[PDB]
Every structure is written in C-alpha cells, then in structure tokens.
Design a protein around this ligand. Sequence first.
Ligand SMILES: CCCS(=O)(=O)Nc1ccc(F)c(NC(=O)c2csc3c(N)ncnc23)c1F
Ligand SMILES: CCCS(=O)(=O)Nc1ccc(F)c(NC(=O)c2csc3c(N)ncnc23)c1F
Lengths: 266, 276
Amino acid sequence: DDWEIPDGQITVGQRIGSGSFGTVYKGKWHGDVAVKMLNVTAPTPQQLQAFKNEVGVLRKTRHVNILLFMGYSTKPQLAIVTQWCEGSSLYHHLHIIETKFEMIKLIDIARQTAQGMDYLHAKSIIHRDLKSNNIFLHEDLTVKIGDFGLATVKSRSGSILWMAPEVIRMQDKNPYSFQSDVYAFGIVLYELMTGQLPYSNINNRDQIIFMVGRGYLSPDLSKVRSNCPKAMKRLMAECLKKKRDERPLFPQILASIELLARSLPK
Amino acid sequence: DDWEIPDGQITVGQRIGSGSFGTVYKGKWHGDVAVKMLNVTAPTPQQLQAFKNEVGVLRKTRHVNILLFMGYSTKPQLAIVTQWCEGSSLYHHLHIIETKFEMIKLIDIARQTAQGMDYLHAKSIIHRDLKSNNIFLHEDLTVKIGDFGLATVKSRWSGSHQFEQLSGSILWMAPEVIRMQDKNPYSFQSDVYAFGIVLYELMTGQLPYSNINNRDQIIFMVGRGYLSPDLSKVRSNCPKAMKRLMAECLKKKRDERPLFPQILASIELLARSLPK
Ligand SMILES: CCCS(=O)(=O)Nc1ccc(F)c(NC(=O)c2csc3c(N)ncnc23)c1F
Ligand SMILES: CCCS(=O)(=O)Nc1ccc(F)c(NC(=O)c2csc3c(N)ncnc23)c1F
C-alpha cells in the first residue's frame, strides 16, 4: 500500500520547472523519474495532512493517457514522483519548435487527449488547467496529461487562453465543471488545427480577459487549415460554446473524434 | 480508490488467450484494454475473497516497465483489466516473426526487463513465471512485464492450468524449481535464472536446448545439473561482459546468482561501452 518513498531512495538531478506550485526536477528511482518538489519548506500538519489527501486523488488514476503517478516524498521535502517522459510537451512541439504534424497525427493527439479526460471525468476529477503545456508527447507518440492534481493544496494567471468564460470572469466560488475542462480542450483543438495560440492579434491581456468573459471575443474558427475535416470545426465550435451547458461531455466528444477519424485516410 | 469496474462497462472483443485458466481478450474500456477472464465457472465465496486479495498485489505496482493494471471485474465473470499494448511479446518477436534486433536495442530490451524486475522485487513480489511471452514490447520499444498476477489463486484451484503452465516454462525454470525438492523453491534468484534465460534468448535469437526434442529428458537433466544453456551460441558481436552476466545469472547453484540492483548496474555499464 502506502506510496511513501523513504529518503535516500530518490536521486535528484537536472532542473526544469518554475513559478510556485513547485519545482520539477528529472530524477532517478528505479530508472529515470520526474520529481515535482513543492519546496513549501517545513510543514506542519494539517498542511501535511492535506498533501496526503491530495495524493489520494492521484492514486485513483490508472490510464495510458494519464501521467503515471509512481509515489510521493515527505521527508527531504513534500514531493510527487511520476514517470519521466521522453520527447517534448505539445505546447513545445506546436509553438516552440513548430513541429508540423501530419493531419492524421493531429487528430490522434486530440483523440488520446479526449480519451484521457473522459477517464479523468469518469473518475470524478476536474483538471482545471488543461492546456497544451500539460499535455505531453511521450516518445512523441503517446499522450500523457499532467498537472491535474493539487487543486486544494493550492487553495490552502497566464493560462487565461484556455479559460472558459465562466472561469475567466472570476465570478462565483467554483467555475470549474467538466464543461470548464471541455472548453479548455476546445482551445487545444483549435491549437492543433491551426498550430497557433488564439487571439494573437490582441496585445492586451486584460482586454482579452474582459471580452472572453463577456462573450464578445472568441477564437477564430476560420484559421483551421484546409486539410482539416469540416466536422472538426463543428466540434470545436461545440466545445467552445460560451454557455457551458451547450458544451458536450467527453464520451460524446470522444465519439465525434473517432467517427470523423476513420473517414479521413479512406 | 477501489478498482472494481461495474458490470457491462467493458467491451470484450478479439479472443487472444488460449489458456485453460481463462481467456485474454482485446477489450474496450476508456480505450483499448486487455481483459483476462478467469472463467473458473462462478465462485464460491470465498475464492472471491482471495481473488480480491490478488488485486491487492496488482495495485502495489506503478512502473513504466510493469504492465499497467487498470482494474478488475467480478460482475459478469471474474476479470483483470490492463492497458492494451500495441506491438507483440518478446517471444513472438524472437521466435514467431523472427525480428532481428539491433545489438543496441537488444541490450536495451534487457535493461528494461531488468529495470522492471528490480522494481517488481523491490516491492517483494516474485514473478514466478518470467519468460519472453510475458515481456511485452509496447510500441516496439518499451518492455511491459506481465502475467505475474494471480499467484495464490492459480496455486490453489482445481484444473490443468496448474499443470500446463508448469510445462509451459520448463525452459526458464531454475534447477531449484525443476526438482520439486520442497514446498517453496521460488525466489528472487529463480527469477534471476529465468531472466538469465531471456538473456540467452536475446543474444542467441533462440530458445535453449533446441536440439533436444524429448522434453521429459530436459527436466531430468537440468534438475540433475547435467544440462545447461550452450553459451557458445551468443552472436559473435555480443559484448563479452553480457556473456559473463549471462553465466553469472544462470548459475546452477542459486546463491551464486546476483540480484537485480547489481544486474542493472552491469547492463547499464555495458550499454555505455558500445555506440561511443
Ligand atoms: C499523476 C500526475 C500528478 S500531477 O501533480 O497532477 N502532475 C505532475 C506531478 C509531478 C510531476 F513531476 C509532473 N511533471 C511535470 O511537471 C513534468 C515537466 S517535464 C516532465 C517530463 N518530461 N516527464 C514527466 N513529468 C514532467 C506532473 F505533471
Ligand atoms: C500486471 C497485470 C496483471 S497480471 O495478471 O500480471 N498480467 C496480465 C493480466 C491481465 C491481462 F489481460 C494480461 N495480458 C495478456 O495476457 C496479454 C496478451 S496480449 C496483451 C497485450 N497486447 N497487451 C496487454 N496484455 C496482453 C496480463 F499480462
């Protein structure tokens, strides 16, 4: 049972992650691992207690498209250990190196991503930050969705682009529904289908923020490339719906992504 | 938490597992899965209870080189559900479709297999049936070790699954195991021995004792120590450290066999001694 990983066992190496929420280092623990060290130095329950509970959510995940939670540290620091992934994140492929994907592959990344989310949701987990930076291309073929945990350890800016309007207008207590995630997905669809971040012709974040939340600005669905199937535009539009209850849930989304997939190379 | 998958959620499809201890099917449940259905025709509380225990073992595993356990069913029949791997088993590649692997790749397959084994052991689980059919090459480049699951349940239900799967792996059995000298011959080391055999498979592209068609004799001879894998068949470009590690691994005397942490060190060492 308990995934406590006693000190001395994990070797820490090369560094990668910034901000708060933690620092991420590439590690070694029965092979190459990833270690996200929260660096929130010396808790102190019930801060300690909260982390143990946050871990509880992670252990509920077992899926090819969800990042493999392997264990957590308490001693050296508070930390979570996951599988390490070769290749780069989708945000990197698309908007940093500009890897041009074949239309067939693009549809597939989407396919897997929806696959993973459907799972997350079926297991009552709201990601609350689905974006192409948290979608990893492992060996550049398999999709691993990460950073969906530790909402709560953050309860006790700059992924605005994926925020649904209800989320964006920091309005009520909990904007986060499955459909909040669906909308974010929509944005990532638009990402794949146009190899671009939305609203790139507006240089004023607050303006984006204001408009998105009011439904005056929305992503420009006509920047999809020609070899992109008509039905993809139809689904993007469905996930991107400003009223949340107009958005499909994932199983239904999944269905559309499959149906339209095996009408493409034929 | 608890992993029981409620009825009729899973979609069974292609039959793949022959086997008299139930069938492996390619399934669908949140994407492609593998479903192994025990089809010992309806328990019997509490075989059921012990079954659930066996999952306790499976849940303990969370490693890239261990076939991802995804959940279990009891509802229609008893079942274990895992990720579906694309690609084929190491058995299939070596012996059925005769894939010639790059020397670098082969050593890598060894490493991973060793890697996963190390972990498997570092969680006090003995495989008891390591062979190249239980080493799966997902996407042709990641080893997922499977079929180490329902140890006790298998060890203790009426049927010829108790027989077949012993016969099914005489080649990988350590001597200690071959001569049923007592109740428990199975060890970290017997696993190391079987691993030593897959090492042979990888380097020789062959099963051992390929020129001894009488299988009853194999059992006698190996148990007595008159027979062991012919290590002069290692393809001429195999690093000579790997040929030594092989020997080290296959030691007839169990306690001369190194354990995985150390094996892993050797494999990683001889890796660095090849491309550069
Ligand atoms: C099961 C996921 C738990 S979580 O907290 O929701 N996500 C989560 C937890 C710990 C991590 F190190 C990471 N990983 C990363 O941030 C990360 C950055 S690069 C990278 C990589 N090449 N392989 C694995 N993980 C990462 C997570 F994505
Ligand atoms: C760690 C998993 C539990 S276990 O009992 O050790 N192994 C185990 C349990 C249920 C399965 F369907 C399988 N899978 C198979 O037998 C199997 C045959 S082909 C195949 C494949 N392409 N991908 C996954 N699994 C399999 C297992 F290997």
